[PDB]
């Protein structure tokens, strides 16, 4: 995904809505040790850039639930916070 985003750039927003359902399922149920697959997906969202304009309302609640969940581990919470920093 990260390589498709840098390749297409502005044209990625045509295809992003197809991928959104899978990304939202990743946050809901991530059993990855220390949720490192979540941290990777945050690093991808940073690359998305101004593509996320029309879809930020979809991605942001999962990210917000991620860094506010106390059960979640600190690395994954820092990764979510740093992502919001970049997207700002």
């Amino acid at each position: 995904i990260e390589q498709i985003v840098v390749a297409l750039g502005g044209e990625f927003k045509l295809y992003l809505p197809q991928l959104i359902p899978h990304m939202l399922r990743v946050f809901m149920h991530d059993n990855s040790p220390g949720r490192i697959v979540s941290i990777k997906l945050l690093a991808a969202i940073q690359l998305f850039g101004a593509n996320l304009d029309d879809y930020l309302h979809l991605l942001l609640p999962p990210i917000v639930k991620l860094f506010d969940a106390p059960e979640a581990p600190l690395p994954s919470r820092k990764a979510a916070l740093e992502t919001v920093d970049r997207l700002t």
């Binding site: 750039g9 502005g10 044209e11 927003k13 850039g49 101004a50 304009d53």
Partner: protein, 48 residues
């Protein structure tokens, strides 16, 4: 609403053609932004 009063009268009031270019520049900034492009101006404007 976005620019400081001083810089507004400099660009948007002095002469028509410059004012027209900057008026249309704001539209360029919006459109090109949606294709990973950022227009650049010499008197730097805050993002509108």
């Amino acid at each position: 609403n976005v620019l400081p009063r001083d810089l507004f009268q400099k660009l948007f009031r002095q002469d028509l053609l410059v004012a027209s270019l900057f008026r249309n520049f704001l539209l360029a900034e919006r459109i090109m932004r949606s294709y990973n492009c950022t227009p650049v101006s010499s008197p730097r404007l805050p993002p509108t």
